[PDB]
Symmetry: C5
Subunit: 306 residues, 5 copies
Amino acid sequence: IYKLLYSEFLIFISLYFAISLVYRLILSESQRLMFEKLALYCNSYAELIPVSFVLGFYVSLVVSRWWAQYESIPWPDRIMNLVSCNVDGEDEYGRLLRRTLMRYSNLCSVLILRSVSTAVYKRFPSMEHVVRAGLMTPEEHKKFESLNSPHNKFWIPCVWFSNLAVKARNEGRIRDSVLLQGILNELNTLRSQCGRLYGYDWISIPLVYTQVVTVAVYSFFLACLIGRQFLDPEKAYPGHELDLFVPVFTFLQFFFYAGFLKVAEQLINPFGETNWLIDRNLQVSLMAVDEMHQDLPILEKDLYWN
Amino acid sequence: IYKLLYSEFLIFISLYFAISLVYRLILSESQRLMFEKLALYCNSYAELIPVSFVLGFYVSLVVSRWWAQYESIPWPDRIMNLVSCNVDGEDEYGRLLRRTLMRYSNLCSVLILRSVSTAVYKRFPSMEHVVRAGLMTPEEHKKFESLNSPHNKFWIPCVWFSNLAVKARNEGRIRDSVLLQGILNELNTLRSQCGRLYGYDWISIPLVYTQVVTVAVYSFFLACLIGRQFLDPEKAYPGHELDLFVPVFTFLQFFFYAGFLKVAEQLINPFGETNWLIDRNLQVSLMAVDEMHQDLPILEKDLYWN
Amino acid sequence: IYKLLYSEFLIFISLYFAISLVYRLILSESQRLMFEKLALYCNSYAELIPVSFVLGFYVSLVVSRWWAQYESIPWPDRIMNLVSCNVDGEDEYGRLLRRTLMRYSNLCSVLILRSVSTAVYKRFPSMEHVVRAGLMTPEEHKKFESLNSPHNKFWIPCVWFSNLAVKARNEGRIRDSVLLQGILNELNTLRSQCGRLYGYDWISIPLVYTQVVTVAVYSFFLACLIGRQFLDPEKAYPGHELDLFVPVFTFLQFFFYAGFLKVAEQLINPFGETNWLIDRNLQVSLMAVDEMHQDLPILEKDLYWN
Amino acid sequence: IYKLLYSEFLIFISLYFAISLVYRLILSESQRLMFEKLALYCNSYAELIPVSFVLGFYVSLVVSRWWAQYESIPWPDRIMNLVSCNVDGEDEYGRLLRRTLMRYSNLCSVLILRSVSTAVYKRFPSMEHVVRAGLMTPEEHKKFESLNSPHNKFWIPCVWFSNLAVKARNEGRIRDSVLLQGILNELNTLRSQCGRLYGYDWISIPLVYTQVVTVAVYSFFLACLIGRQFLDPEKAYPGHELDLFVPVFTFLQFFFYAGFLKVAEQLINPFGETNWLIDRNLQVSLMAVDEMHQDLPILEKDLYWN
Amino acid sequence: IYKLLYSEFLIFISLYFAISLVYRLILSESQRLMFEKLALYCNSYAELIPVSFVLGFYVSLVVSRWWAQYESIPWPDRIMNLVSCNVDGEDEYGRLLRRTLMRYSNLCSVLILRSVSTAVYKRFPSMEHVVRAGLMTPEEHKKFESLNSPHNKFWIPCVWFSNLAVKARNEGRIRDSVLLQGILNELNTLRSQCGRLYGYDWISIPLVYTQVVTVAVYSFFLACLIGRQFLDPEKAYPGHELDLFVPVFTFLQFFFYAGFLKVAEQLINPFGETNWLIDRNLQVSLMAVDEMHQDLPILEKDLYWN
């Protein structure tokens, strides 16, 4: 939080100490008494601004939407267990057939993470970077851009997947219709999880609810630039009986009320190590359909037999 | 929120400054002292109205019902992956057969969004506008209005869908019974999601719970038209030691307590870009069952082979 | 809320103005000073009763159980899509066979709504009213009451349903075993939703948690019959510096703290237009298995073909 | 709550009135002034103990775990609809075969409710009481106790169930493999619901979180034995201007803060009428597989035919 | 909580009594008056630190993530019911075949619990301890470490499982394709539950949200080392009218605000008796596929027959 509060905090340190130096050195004595009345006014009536109430529900919606995206991580490990076993063949066709199926299922999640996450988007700026990272063969790029559509194209590989499995069934690679439908029902589970992330980016927390909660924090501490001044102890106002030149508890109070504001900036749109997550789901999925197709260990007895 | 608070806010600015001009220019000195006693009374006892408690749970129910409708967006991308692959045929019959199936599944969500959303309803005022936008052929409109029913008719295409797939199976287009049941089980998932939006419009947040929370905000600031007046500083009441002619912190306090009231007016009934969402789900679904039926890219090797 | 607060509110108006007339006209001057000490005592120490804390969680459980019953509305539209297509036959047997299946599935929800809802129970007082409304033939009523069971009998039609579909399969009306199991798996989804409403009536919010929250509201305002009196302004107590003869902010405070109590009486047991919901689910379900069995519109081309 | 607060409440009535009689009759006048200083100290500084904050989240976890167990009630009505229809046979074997299947599915929930509920455990103290109540034949008791296992044995009938259905399939009682798998997939739903109750008893709310919230209530009112004393009105302390000999609002404040503590004792471990629930699920399940196997009513026409 | 608060509590007892002894014995009388002004300053302005607000939501996220992991306990009892019945064979091959399937399904949860739980990790430090506990034969360890992968390897047995069942089907041990797919669909449910625990360890509660809530507790009671001092009663400050040498209510206030901090340290990463849970899921799963394959009790009549 110290990195996120290097900008807004030191402005508030600067905006306080400016006004503190102006009051102590620049104002005439007749004009200081004008400042003392506004300082007593803004100290008692800045509690009318519901800072703990407005900011309290905005964290209850940034985070309750933040947690709903980590049940939305598309793991290919459910399709991987069924492509590895059912799509038969050890020759260079069926070995190529299984690697293509688990490459489309990962491409159906890279094309959505490069529109919701800046970390993936700086790894894959254009579509040419997807080809050079092995997620798309050059012959698939020509078919990807003859399909003229002004919308997002993350649904392209999840239709190529389901058309390849049926083509795989009609050549005898998948045995029955039930084993074919078992793959397609696990495609549409990963299509739902990828379909959530597209739905969460397109449906943000509304602008009407963000512009409210950023005034309630800033207009509070705008009044605290005046209402938290150390007044003159010679006038002996009730409450300001001591001069200390640094408001310790005001700067702590700005640290937390603006702290949740900078936290909720972060958690409204996460994924700002998906560079690691994509490198896992590609390296595992191609591993478990090529090296582990029928390579099983040897069946032997356990330590509990008779 | 500034657009939503152009009406209620400037009335409250007008209702304050009217009474402020009446007290400062119209009341006699004997009658001003009558006003000063009511101003001190309504300042101390307007805190008895639980504004932060009544409004606190109404936002907890407008929004917790608002978020439950965005898991209810009917996406056709689960039926689209199975109509594209299983319903065989490249001739002009099966090409027409697949386009009809994905047109009924989109029509089973336009007919529910034109009764829950004013944006869709101004795009489709009558049923004639649905025909001219290609969602319904003219021969389907005659069958749509011989079915005499006083209720909503959004369930009509989702029965025409399931009767067409079985007619498609009996002509040999779908291979097995499992692949037929795989389509119908994914119909009834989109029928459940469309069934939620019909259930959410018919079950609103009750009138007994809205009429409570709109008195608690308005009757508070009705007392704040009197209890927040800048009194005469010559009388030297405790608290009103300064005249400033504009209550800054009261107008901020009205900005947030009526702010959540106008936000909860918006989020109790959302969809007031479904004009874009309908144009996506029609343009994608007809694309992936006509241009992408067996048009697959050429299988080649990846960048990780040996 | 005005209809629900016609009884408890006017008692509280009467109980206040009685004591206000007794203090102003009946008590002797020596006995008025005894009343002034109890009024100051009950004004400062009635804040010890946690009204906003006890009532705050009871609304958090009435409503969080209220919202869980509207995902429990049994819609027959999932069984209707599969009875309409799979149960073949156009003769007067299979036409009678499909209407019987969708009549048992609606009877398996009327028999549970006539034990959880007073609105349905006044429409169907006895079992004879169910026969005259067409939900049960007279020959089914004799079989319904030879089954001797002291418990609820809402599970009777959902077993008659699953025994009729298997009898329908053995006569050749349903084609395969998968299409039979597709109907029975959608029966057991509607059996779960009807099974929730039976579980919610049998498991109420406990008596130990309702008797707490109805003392905390009533014993608060029992003290507010004394602690909110307008005292004599001649004695000049701190706080009671003005006589106004009507406590406006106390009557508003009773309007909301007893307001949530009457709201939570309503939402602990909803359905007190299920007379419309039953008339929809019967009129739609019999419509879509008799008039819409194989009556499909004519396949023609859309407005986007070449 | 009056039954649950007969023990802790009257101790607090006794502990108050003891100290009240000691202060008024036993202490010397010099020693009373020592007591008056501690009474003023414990009145102002007992508000530092966060009673409304510590107890506020413990109710938010007792009840949020309490409500998650009533979606965990194992209803046999999903298996009952499939055993009644698919397991064929009207002779004394298949009649015995269906009754055994629905008896194992109820025994797979009695053996878990006799370890989580004291009400079931006093009905079934040992395993011999299960035999005499008809839930287990004497020949099944010998096989139940040759299976040597130090853990809980509630999973024993749910494996005997799935081994009997496959034995039923190999004798021709169940027709296809899909109808066999339809029973086993509905077994594993009731195995999950019974698996929740075993998981909820084994994972309690931790001891580190219960010992916190029982100090915060008791150490508060331990200070309220001193801080709520009616002091001497002759000394004229601020606040204690009246002697009344019974603290009405303190005893109400103890009624609710200890009220939620006794409520959360009840709802952390419910089921302390499962004697009725077990008698329902046995009497219904054996009824709907013996009297209602193919006993259907006669098909006749409804009141809406032509 | 007493064990968890042996470290931080006695430091706070020591840090208080140090400053209390310094003020009472070391400071000069002119320097004591400097301390009295800071004690009055830190007593009134330490309430500006939102301790009950910052810590209130951190418990709402530690625990709401804590409860979501106990629906994530991988129970093998759903696969166990289907391996026991469908994988046929009583000879020493099929007896070895069923024990291997339920050993891979337990190994697919030990390899994830030895990276998320320190209790399992001290039981299984290296992979050699897994072999000596019977969870992995020595021939499986060579195949486990030829699969070169820098990521976690918990997905290895859940692919060996699905490759063994298909190898079991092609030798005639499993009858149909539906019974094969019934096992694989229950594998991918246990793969999802094991997939949650890997997702919960990799996605912790962020460092930006923990470093906030540990300053708000500690910087509060850092000021309470000064603001809670018993001042000199001879100076007669308002509030400090009594010397007692031990702040009872401050030490209680530190007991709960730091109490939730130490509780949330525990519940952010639970499983710190999984040594019992692993010993159950191995001893039960191998028991119900070897001793209970077709060993059923003898079918006899119940106590309710005619």
